[PDB]
DNA sequence: ATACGATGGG
DNA sequence: CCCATCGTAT
């Protein structure tokens, strides 16, 4: 018995690994019928990323037994750089032994590449992210959000996000002076705030600017905040699932 | 208060890109006629002079003349947080030692506000009189930038020789000797010459000057014996940027 | 004097990009038939052979044969001062040690003139005589460049295996094993008399693929116990061949 | 941290 | 064929 998943849009998988490799190097892929789930904290335990790819998003998905694949994300991103952006990527793992096979098929079907990747024995054991609801939920174009985080990183190392019914404000402050970006509430080009209470948290731009490498996956990003609680930045992945990143304040 | 609104914020970004490599600190001389800036490079080899007329701005209010001392490095960094289509507004209030930059998104949902510490600085030069020059070459700026880049791969100095018909640029080094000869033709070369001239300049400086290239599709070289070269970039309905380089 | 005018100067810029990484010094063999150049890499693993026929030039005059010794690094730097649409003219006078390059702008206002110091260097890489090979693979050059780049991320050597239907490229290292299998098919063409399996160093193949801009195809010719020939044809002038020993 | 060249995309 | 972005090299 074996795991095998075929993905006609191989570029999603290349984008997902770009969005993770800077933050994590090693992660356990939790493969099952429901699909692929991945959850890891950054080397420093400051942030946690959680990937969901549903079975239905794949063109073909067979999972005979659940597996816990430990994968070096650096290696896998390297192996994915040998996939053309228009290739059909297929992942295959046989329930015994320790190797993931990647197969990149050329649309023409004259070139077929076949990589075998050494898995890791990494003993993940990771917590439960429950459903939860937050004081302010900002929804905004991801490129705007990326740009905001890049700009303010030129002023300071920390950004102070302040949210109110009408608008969210991002601020940084350093040797050059102070910056202050104030978004107001407005195929995905407008800002939307759903807020129950107001909130003002401060985060490190270094981490937010890792999160924004997910930007190619999604035209929108969702920020959820509540006091003394990690920020959730979420990128929906087409009709497959999501990528969330949690960052603790201060 | 001083306040100037500029709908084409990308000019101001470009102006600061063209200066920051050459100067780090400069006193903006703000008045009703407009903004003037004039300053030598760190080594006093070259002098740059910026003119932005009041009428080039979309709004310009100058209650009292000021001398704003601004760190160009800091201001360029702050301008990198402006989108190329943003409306930039500069605002400085009598008394305060802080320049406000405000970048407004065309959509008008995102508005950025930066506040920049000013420096205490005085309007560091007067000079650069009106004169008429022996040879005035007018040429596509990208051609001129390319010429200065190419010859910098041969030598450290370029010898510019001008005659009625044409100007010639030459350099010489370890690899050999290069020689670009332009003939008289914002896509063509034009020479207005009263006398001929042959001056030698350092390419290191000319290659700073060419960072102004984005401001203008043409550049004007004015030359006369024993006198600094003027390289001028006219700015889209606002004014100019001139750089003076002494021969050698 | 020697004098050759080339309306498509970008070929000569490309030819020097394709050689400078592999060789730094080479003797240009100028003659009536045209320009020939032949030289081994610094470590004598590989030999490159350039052919530019007299008929490919827009003008070609060679009064007597010369052996111009040229620093390819210097000449590439000088060629970087040529616009991609310029007319390049090479001129050498029999008893001078200087090559003149002249770049004319299509407009003909901008004319650049460079003079380049020649070197006094011998000439013999012994070349390779023409032969017929067991497997000849013909394929898009950018595919071949990509293949060589990809597998260089897995291993340092590639094992090229050819059969009537298809060729396979394989590499193997710390990350694991890769394996690209092309089938005969813009398109891949195999002419094979016998099957062939040789192993080459990717370090070298990846220098060879700097010729890629010269040609939309590349030809690999192989036979046992004999160097691989990778050939790039040059637009109506000739070719660039690189031989790598297994 | 900054400035230039080379590359890929439009 | 030009530009902008990345990567490098100072």
Ramachandran class of A222: left when φ > 0, alpha when ψ lies in -120 to 50, beta otherwise: beta
3-state secondary structure of B114: strand
Backbone angles phi, psi at B49, to 5 degrees: -130, 110
Declared resolution, Å: 2.8
**Residue the block writes with tokens 């003659």:** C31
Residue of B147, B166, B178, B185 to mutate when probing chain C, most C C-beta within 10 A: B178
Backbone angles phi, psi at C239, to 5 degrees: -155, 170
Distances, alpha carbon A97 to alpha carbons A2, A68, A93, A118, A122, in Å: 11, 12, 9, 10, 14
Evaluate whether B79 touches B12 at the Cβ level (below 8 Å): yes
How far apart are alpha carbons C129 and B140 in whole angstroms?
52
Which two structure tokens, joined as six digits, stand for A221?
């990003």
Which two structure tokens, joined as six digits, stand for A112?
């077929």
Distances, alpha carbon A103 to alpha carbons A63, A109, C170, in Å: 17, 12, 14
DSSP string, A181-229: EEEE-------EEEESS-EEEEEEHHHHHHHGGGGGG-SEEEEEE-TTS
CB pair distance less than 8 Å for C183 and A82: no
Evaluate whether A77 touches A84 at the Cβ level (below 8 Å): no
Through-space distance between the first and last CA atoms of chain C, rounded to whole angstroms: 42
Q: Which residues contact B147 (CB under 8 A, 6 or more apart)?
A: B169, B180
Q: Nearest to residue B216, comparing CAs of B23, B6, B18, B4? A: B18
Which two structure tokens, joined as six digits, stand for A196?
């129950």
Can you point out the beta strands (E) in C105-236?
Answer: 111-117, 135-140, 157-162, 166-172, 176-183, 189-192, 196-201, 217-222, 228-234
Q: Nearest to residue B24, comparing CAs of B121, B125, B127? A: B121
How far apart are alpha carbons C246 and C90 in whole angstroms?
37
How far apart are alpha carbons B148 and B207 in whole angstroms?
6
Residue of C149, C174, C177, C182 to mutate when probing chain A, most A C-beta within 10 A: C177
Q: Which nucleotide has the shortest C1'-to-CA distance from B17?
A: D3
How many other CB atoms sit within 10 Å of the CB of residue A28? 21
Question: Domain spans of chain A?
Answer: 1-250
Q: Which residues contact A167 (CB under 8 A, 6 or more apart)?
A: A182, A183, A184, A185, A191, A193
How many other CB atoms sit within 10 Å of the CB of residue A188? 12
Can you point out the beta strands (E) in chain B?
Answer: 2-6, 25-31, 34-40, 46-53, 59-62, 66-71, 87-92, 98-104, 110-117, 135-140, 157-162, 166-172, 176-183, 190-193, 197-202, 218-223, 229-235, 239-245
Evaluate whether C76 touches C114 at the Cβ level (below 8 Å): no
How far apart are alpha carbons A245 and A240 in whole angstroms?
17
Distances, alpha carbon C147 to alpha carbons A138, C74, C138, C160, C171, in Å: 45, 31, 14, 11, 11
**Residue the block writes with tokens 């600094």:** B228
Distances, alpha carbon B199 to alpha carbons B141, B170, B232, B235, C109, in Å: 20, 11, 17, 27, 21
Q: Which residues contact C6 (CB under 8 A, 6 or more apart)?
A: C12, C56, C57, C58, C87, C88, C89, C90
User: Rounded to the nearest 5 degrees, what angle is found at the Cα of A159, between the Cα atoms of A158 and A165?
Assistant: 160
Evaluate whether C201 touches C157 at the Cβ level (below 8 Å): yes
DSSP A174: -
Which two structure tokens, joined as six digits, stand for B105?
């998104």
How far apart are alpha carbons A31 and A68 in whole angstroms?
6
Distances, alpha carbon C238 to alpha carbons A185, C231, C242, in Å: 65, 10, 14
Ramachandran class of C44: left when φ > 0, alpha when ψ lies in -120 to 50, beta otherwise: left
Report domain B1-248's class.
Answer: alpha beta
Q: Nearest to residue A72, comparing CAs of A18, A19, A7, A28? A: A28
How many other CB atoms sit within 10 Å of the CB of residue C142? 15
Name residue B115's beta-bridge partners: A178, B100
Q: Which residues contact C15 (CB under 8 A, 6 or more apart)?
A: C50, C52, C214, C234, C240
DSSP A87: P
Residues packed against strand E, CB within 7 Å? B 142; C 84-85
Which fold would CATH assign to domain C1-246?
Proliferating Cell Nuclear Antigen (3.70.10)
Backbone angles phi, psi at C142, to 5 degrees: -75, -30
Give the dihedral sign, CA C135/A109/A82/C211.
positive
Backbone angles phi, psi at A217, to 5 degrees: -75, -25
Q: Nearest to residue C55, comparing CAs of C234, C245, C244? A: C234
Backbone angles phi, psi at A12, to 5 degrees: -65, -45
How far apart are alpha carbons A232 and A249 in whole angstroms?
11
Ramachandran class of A211: left when φ > 0, alpha when ψ lies in -120 to 50, beta otherwise: alpha
Q: Nearest to residue B189, comparing CAs of B134, B138, B133, B135? A: B138
Q: Which strands form B176-183's sheet, in the order they lie side by side?
A: B197-202, B157-162, B166-172, B176-183, C111-117, C98-104, C87-92, C2-6, C59-62
Which chains neighbour C (Cβ–Cβ under 8 Å, 3 or more pairs)? A, B
Number of residues that this document lists for chain B: 248
How many other CB atoms sit within 10 Å of the CB of residue B22? 23
Evaluate whether B91 touches B118 at the Cβ level (below 8 Å): no
3-state secondary structure of C111: strand
Chain A hits for B79, Cβ within 8 Å: none
Q: Which nucleotide has the shortest C1'-to-CA distance from C85?
A: E1
- Segment holding C10, helix H or strand E: helix C10-20
Kind of pairing, strands B66-71 and B59-62?
A: unpaired
Chain C hits for A90, Cβ within 8 Å: none
- Segment holding C145, helix H or strand E: helix C141-152
Protein-proximal nucleotides of chain D (any atom < 7 Å from a CB) = 2-6
CATH architecture assigned to A1-250: Box (3.70)
DSSP A104: E
Give the dihedral sign, CA B142/B144/B149/B151.
positive
Q: Tell me which method was used to determine the 3D structure.
A: X-ray
How far apart are alpha carbons A214 and C63 in whole angstroms?
64
Q: Nearest to residue A52, comparing CAs of A231, A240, A221? A: A240
How far apart are alpha carbons A186 and A166 in whole angstroms?
9
Name residue A242's beta-bridge partners: A52, A236
Q: Nearest to residue A23, comparing CAs of A240, A174, A235, A241? A: A235
Burial track B219-247 (b if 16+ CB lie within 10 A, e otherwise): bbbbbbeebbbbbbbbbeebbbbbbbbbb
Evaluate whether A172 touches A153 at the Cβ level (below 8 Å): yes
Provide residues of A within 8 Å CB-CB of chain B.
144, 147, 151-152, 154-155, 175-184, 186, 190-191
How many other CB atoms sit within 10 Å of the CB of residue B149? 15
How far apart are alpha carbons B238 and A71 in whole angstroms?
59
Distances, alpha carbon A117 to alpha carbons A77, B55, C179, in Å: 11, 65, 12
Evaluate whether A50 touches A244 at the Cβ level (below 8 Å): yes
User: How far: C76 CA to E9 C1' (Å)?
Assistant: 20
How far apart are alpha carbons A33 and A54 in whole angstroms?
9
Q: Which long-range contacts (CB under 8 A, 24 or more apart) does B5-9 make?
A: B5/B57, B5/B58, B5/B59, B5/B60, B5/B87, B5/B88, B5/B89, B6/B57, B6/B58, B6/B87, B6/B88, B6/B89, B6/B90, B7/B58, B7/B87, B8/B236, B9/B82, B9/B83, B9/B84, B9/B85, B9/B86, B9/B87, B9/B88, B9/B103
- Segment holding A116, helix H or strand E: strand A111-118
Chain A hits for C178, Cβ within 8 Å: 79, 82, 113-115
């Amino acid at each position: 018995h074996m795991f095998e998943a075929r993905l006609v849009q191989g570029s999603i998988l290349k984008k997902v690994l770009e969005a993770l490799k800077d933050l994590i190097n090693e992660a356990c892929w939790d493969i099952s019928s429901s699909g692929v789930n991945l959850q890891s904290m950054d080397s420093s335990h400051v942030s946690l990323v959680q990937l969901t790819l549903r079975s239905e998003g794949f063109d073909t998905y067979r999972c005979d037994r659940n597996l816990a694949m430990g994968v070096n994300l650096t290696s896998m991103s390297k192996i994915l750089k040998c996939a053309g952006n228009e290739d059909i990527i297929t992942l295959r793992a046989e329930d015994n032994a320790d190797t993931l096979a990647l197969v990149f098929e050329a649309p023409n079907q004259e070139k077929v590449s076949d990589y075998e990747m050494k898995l890791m024995d990494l003993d993940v054991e990771q917590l439960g992210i429950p459903e939860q609801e937050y004081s302010c939920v900002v929804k905004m174009p991801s490129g705007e959000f990326a740009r905001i985080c890049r700009d303010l990183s030129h002023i300071g190392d920390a950004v102070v996000i302040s949210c109110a019914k009408d608008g969210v404000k991002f601020s940084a402050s350093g040797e050059l002076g102070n910056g202050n970006i104030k978004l107001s509430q407005t195929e995905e080009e407008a800002v939307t705030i759903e807020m129950n209470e107001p909130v003002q948290l401060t985060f490190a731009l270094r981490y937010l600017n890792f999160f924004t490498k997910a930007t190619p996956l999604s035209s929108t990003v969702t920020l959820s905040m509540s006091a003394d609680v990690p920020l959730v930045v979420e990128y929906k992945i087409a009709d497959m699932g999501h990528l969330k990143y949690y960052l603790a304040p201060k």
